[PDB]
Amino acid sequence: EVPLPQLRAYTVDASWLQPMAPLQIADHTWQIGTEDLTALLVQTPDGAVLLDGGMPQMASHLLDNMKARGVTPRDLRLILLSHAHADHAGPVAELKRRTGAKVAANAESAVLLARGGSDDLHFGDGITYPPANADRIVMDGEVITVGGIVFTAHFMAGHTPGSTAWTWTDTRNGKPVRIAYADSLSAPGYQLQGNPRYPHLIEDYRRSFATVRALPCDVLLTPHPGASNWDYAAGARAGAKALTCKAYADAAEQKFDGQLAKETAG
Numbered sequence: 001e002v003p004l005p006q007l008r009a010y011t012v013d014a015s016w017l018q019p020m021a022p023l024q025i026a027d028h029t030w031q032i033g034t035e036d037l038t039a040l041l042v043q044t045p046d047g048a049v050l051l052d053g054g055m056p057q058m059a060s061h062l063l064d065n066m067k068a069r070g071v072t073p074r075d076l077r078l079i080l081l082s083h084a085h086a087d088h089a090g091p092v093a094e095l096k097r098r099t100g101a102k103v104a105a106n107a108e109s110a111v112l113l114a115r116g117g118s119d120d121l122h123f124g125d126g127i128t129y130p131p132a133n134a135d136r137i138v139m140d141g142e143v144i145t146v147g148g149i150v151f152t153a154h155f156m157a158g159h160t161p162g163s164t165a166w167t168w169t170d171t172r173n174g175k176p177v178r179i180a181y182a183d184s185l186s187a188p189g190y191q192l193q194g195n196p197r198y199p200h201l202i203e204d205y206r207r208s209f210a211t212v213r214a215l216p217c218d219v220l221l222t223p224h225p226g227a228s229n230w231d232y233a234a235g236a237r238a239g240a241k242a243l244t245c246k247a248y249a250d251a252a253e254q255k256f257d258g259q260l261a262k263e264t265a266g
């Protein structure tokens with residue numbers, strides 16, 4: 001006679017959990033996550049912004065990297081998110097407890113974050129994490145300003161309903177660098193067609209491809225660096241092979257179209 005199964009932990013490739021030292025992207029912007037998950041620290045004269053934290057167990061590593069950059073816990077002011085899955089929003093609750101930081105997010109991302117990623121449209125309760133509350137709700141095209149650095153939200157619903165690209169202009173060599181942190185455009189194991197939980201999924205992905213294509217985008221980064229052809233472990237040439245936003249959108253749409261054809265066959 002047979003017991004119910006044990007809960008299964010959300011396990012991931014080792015590289016997703018492999019710590020790295022801070023890697024500078026531009027004058028104020030640093031990758032402080034792991035080798036295969038993005039967590040961006042933007043340092044300003046008036047405190048720091050974090051865009052994503054990666055997995056739940058990355059909190060202490062992120063704070064260690066912030067310390068290495070001269071950002072104490074009290075200096076972290078704002079947390080922004082690409083999307084509220086466990087592999088990007090994992091440590092957010094813990095970061096809020098351990099720091100000054102408040103969270104800004106759209107309504108979709110706020111509702112998913114508040115349930116710790118449970119009742120996911122596609123994953124059910126398989127990929128959960130500690131719940132957190134948003135301190136501010138943002139609308140599409142709304143800007144947030146920290147220490148003179150302006151962050152713009154561009155909604156790109158698909159991967160999750162609240163999926164967001166964040167854009168801001170940093171500098172390098174006395175010139176502006178328009179950074180686009182564009183969310184995932186994957187649909188891993190999703191039912192795309194006729195999904196009762198997401199009836200207009202396909203139309204949203206199509207609009208999201210177009211949004212990503214048109215972003216101000218001297219430099220693209222993505223929550224999974226591989227999606228944009230970054231190699232964070234390659235030091236001075238980490239970003240050399242990086243995709244444009246145009247190429248990223250196009251590659252995603254081709255994969256998505258292939259997925260639709262396979263789903264129809266399957």
Ligand SMILES: c1cnc2c(c1)ccc1cccnc12
Binds near residue numbers: 028045147170171
């Ligand atoms: C001090 C130093 N660098 C900055 C500011 C203040 C404000 C805005 C800004 C925008 C892009 C790059 N650097 C800065």
Ligand SMILES: [Cu+2]
Binds near residue numbers: 027028171
């Ligand atoms: Cu500056």
Ligand SMILES: [Cu+2]
Binds near residue numbers: 085184
């Ligand atoms: Cu995700």
Ligand SMILES: [Cu+2]
Binds near residue numbers: 085088184223224
């Ligand atoms: Cu992810």
